[PDB]
Amino acid sequence: SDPVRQYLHEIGQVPLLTLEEEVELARKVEEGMEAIKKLSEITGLDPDLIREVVRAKILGSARVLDPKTVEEIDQKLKSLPKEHKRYLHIAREGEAARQHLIEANLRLVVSIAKKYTGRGLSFLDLIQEGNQGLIRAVEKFEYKRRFKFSTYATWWIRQAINRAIADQARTIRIPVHMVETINKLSRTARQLQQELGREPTYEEIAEAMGPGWDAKRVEETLKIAQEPVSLETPIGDEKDSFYGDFIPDEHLPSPVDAA
Amino acid sequence: YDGRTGEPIEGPIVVGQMFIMKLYHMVEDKMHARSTGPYSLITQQPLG
């Protein structure tokens, strides 16, 4: 078992990149995107559809839009006289380069994500969201600026991880902005406690937050931030009493009321 | 002597002073009865 070591092994089974290979792959991806848009202009079809069919042909039969239409469009692309099959070639090469770049940079995602444990998401969920951010960064990277890929990719990986944490960490979903409000309130209260030598009051937290903040608003914000408890929480030393055994039902009418 | 008849118990009886305590187990706190009442959420069975 232990899927973390399994994934780490699969990750380390791919060699890292040097500057030459990384810049070569990024350039190949950029030229592939340019070739894709040129091909779309030549054939008159949508860039998205042509990108999808080219990616399907690159990934092959292993990855399961249907074979009929993709084969039709792939043959229509083979109908180009010359100087356009070249664009098709650069498109395919750029897609292969995109795949290779993502695979090679998968380790930075793990290195970043190992610092966000213990915040309501498991390690592998954090890794997968970081992978999504990495794919975004590969999509948006620009090698002309002579910047190392990790420099640009770290921002997108962090954005993906934080958005995932704010979106999927609570049983009751809270909007992103108000999650940031809760986190800011917690940080403010913690620093106030550190300075005061005791737990602050709602008035002091309101004053420290700034304008537009009073004790009632702080109370409401702390009220909504409560997480639900488990109906299966054990009660007592023995494993025979749970929490939900003490909670009556108020919806269904009682026999007295029905009579 | 028997208090109901005034006659003596037929044999001598051991009598003396003993130290006796009252325990926290009182029948006032334990007697419980129910006809109908609250029911649980999932099973719809009476609570305990």
Curated annotation (Swiss-Prot), chain A:
Q: Where is this region: Sigma-70 factor domain-3?
A: 180-258
Please identify the protein, giving its name as recorded.
Answer: RNA polymerase sigma factor SigA
Organism per entry: Thermus thermophilus (strain ATCC BAA-163 / DSM 7039 / HB27)
Q: Which residues of the full protein are shown?
A: 78 to 345 of 423
Gene responsible for this protein: sigA
Intracellular or extracellular location(s) = Cytoplasm
Q: How does it assemble?
A: Interacts transiently with the RNA polymerase catalytic core formed by RpoA, RpoB, RpoC and RpoZ (2 alpha, 1 beta, 1 beta' and 1 omega subunit) to form the RNA polymerase holoenzyme that can initiate transcription.
Keywords from the named record: Cytoplasm, DNA-binding, Sigma factor, Transcription, Transcription regulation
Q: Any transmembrane segments, and where? A: none
Q: Which GO terms describe its molecular function?
A: DNA binding; sigma factor activity
| Motif residue range(s): Interaction with polymerase core subunit RpoC | 125-128
GO CC entries: cytoplasm
Function per UniProt: Sigma factors are initiation factors that promote the attachment of RNA polymerase to specific initiation sites and are then released. This sigma factor is the primary sigma factor during exponential growth.
UniProtKB/Swiss-Prot annotation, chain B:
Q: Which family does it belong to?
A: Belongs to the RNA polymerase beta chain family.
The entry's function note states: DNA-dependent RNA polymerase catalyzes the transcription of DNA into RNA using the four ribonucleoside triphosphates as substrates.
Partners and quaternary state? The RNAP catalytic core consists of 2 alpha, 1 beta, 1 beta' and 1 omega subunit. When a sigma factor is associated with the core the holoenzyme is formed, which can initiate transcription.
* Protein name as it appears in the record: DNA-directed RNA polymerase subunit beta
Q: What species was this sequence derived from?
A: Thermus thermophilus (strain ATCC 27634 / DSM 579 / HB8)
**Which residues of the whole protein are included?**
975 to 1022 of 1119
